[PDB]
């Protein structure tokens, strides 16, 4: 009977008010979850619990403590029961797309077992080979076209009505998610962040005045430039969703976006120049001057690196429902040939989704495909729940390759305290040489601020 995290929902409703068909969560319930609440919240949000306490969000380090609030975490006054489960990943090593798909439809206990199981819960018949009389062994993977489909060998004869017509499992249309924030990096080969230049010199103040309202501003482009391998060639299909920059890795500052739906294997480098300008608003004395230092650096970097690629397929379901005792929605006896598939991965549409027909169960108008609590009734919950657990197991490729970048940057205008003469500006720039460093239409010029 836990709470279940991803049926909460939050009200803003007023003091421990809840919409309807929903009650406010108790510290202890809170407390249970925790963590999932709190990954929730925004930084500094703060939200009611029932009966005085609040709970608050990350920036407050997720603290339960007394309070009021005028949102209100909430629970269904009849949740869902009995979720499936969600596993940890099961992680393939890197490699082609063939030898990656290979060690996932091989996997007795991983894949084979389980989604013969899911067959046979579903009322799917002879889902097994003729030499073993249980299900999900003696199977045959073999592969067919794009895919790959596991089916009971059927050589020889067998016992049992319609006994040759074996049920076919068929895996198709796999497609590889690049997890942008699975970044892991190997041991750094190459880091520095090297001075290359020092500009030094000096701003002066040479009114009567104390002078101040004034920018002094450094203004300079420089290129950034990256590349990256690919060790094997499944990352020529994977892709990531949504745009993303890449992580930062050291001191070394860089601006690096890999783009959505692109080859992953596509985007092996670039280069990109950018005008930059940093000021800093110095007060000077009257008749004073104060130093001016800017450091020029060049940075690079180079790690072995690896993300993880989220692997779906479709499942396609094929074979004839037993009499007496199949899932389908209509529970047909006439032992009709069937075809379903359920996309495994991504959500697509409510027929093809386990979690969602699962969810949705004790709701009889949703029920229009799969009979779940038959399915239940007949094999009991855990058995139900462990069995799609597996099915339904995040399965992630990795997607490795070398990684290397190499910028120029400025620090930041750095200013001394001021001297007595025993805006004007002394500091020397030699555009030559700042061009052969990689520094390049570089300026210092001062402004009304």
Not at 367 to 372: A, F, G, L, R, T
Not at 385 to 393: C, D, I, M, P
Request: aromatic share 12%; hydrophobic share 35%; with cysteine.
């Amino acid at each position: 009977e836990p709470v279940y995290p991803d049926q909460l929902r939050l009200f803003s409703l007023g003091q421990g008010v809840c919409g309807d068909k929903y009650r406010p969560v108790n510290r202890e319930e809170a407390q249970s979850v925790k963590s999932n609440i709190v990954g929730m919240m925004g930084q500094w949000q703060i939200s009611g619990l029932a009966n005085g306490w609040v709970i608050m969000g990350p920036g407050y380090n997720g603290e339960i403590k007394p309070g009021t609030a005028s949102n209100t975490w909430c629970y269904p006054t009849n949740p869902v029961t009995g979720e499936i489960p969600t596993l940890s990943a099961l992680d393939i090593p890197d490699g082609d797309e063939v030898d990656v798909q290979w060690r996932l439809v091989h996997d007795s206990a991983n894949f084979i077992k389980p989604t013969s199981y899911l067959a046979h819960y579903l009322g799917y018949a002879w889902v097994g080979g003729n030499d073993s009389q249980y299900v999900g062994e003696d199977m045959d993977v073999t592969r067919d076209g794009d895919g790959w489909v596991i089916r009971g060998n059927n050589d020889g004869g067998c016992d049992g009505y319609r006994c040759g017509d074996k049920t076919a499992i068929k895996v198709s249309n796999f497609a590889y998610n690049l997890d942008p924030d699975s970044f892991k990096h190997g041991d750094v080969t190459q880091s520095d962040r090297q001075l290359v230049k020092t500009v030094v010199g000096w701003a002066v103040n040479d009114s009567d005045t104390p002078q101040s309202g004034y920018d002094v501003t450094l203004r300079y482009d420089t290129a950034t430039n990256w590349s990256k391998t690919n060790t094997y060639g499944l990352s020529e299909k994977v892709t990531t969703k949504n745009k993303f920059k890449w992580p930062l890795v050291g001191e070394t500052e860089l601006s690096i976006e890999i783009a959505a739906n692109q080859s992953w294997a596509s985007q092996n480098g670039g280069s990109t120049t950018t005008s930059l300008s940093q000021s800093v608003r110095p007060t000077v004395p009257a008749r004073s001057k104060i130093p001016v230092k800017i450091e020029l650096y060049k940075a690079d970097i180079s790690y072995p690196y690896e993300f993880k690629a989220d692997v779906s397929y479709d499942l396609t379901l094929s074979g004839f429902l037993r009499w007496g005792g199949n899932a389908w929605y209509t529970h047909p006896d006439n032992r009709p040939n069937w075809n379903h598939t359920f996309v495994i991965g991504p959500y697509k549409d409510k027929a093809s989704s386990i979690r969602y027909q699962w969810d949705k169960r004790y709701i009889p108008g949703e029920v229009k495909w799969w009979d779940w609590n038959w399915t239940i009734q007949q094999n009991g919950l855990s058995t139900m729940q462990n069995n799609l657990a597996r099915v339904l197991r995040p399965v992630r490729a990795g997607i490795t390759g070398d990684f290397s970048a190499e910028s120029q940057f400025a620090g930041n205008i750095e200013i001394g305290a001021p001297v007595p003469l025993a805006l004007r500006l002394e500091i020397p720039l030699d555009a030559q040489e700042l061009s052969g460093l990689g520094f390049n239409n570089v300026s210092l010029s001062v402004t009304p601020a």
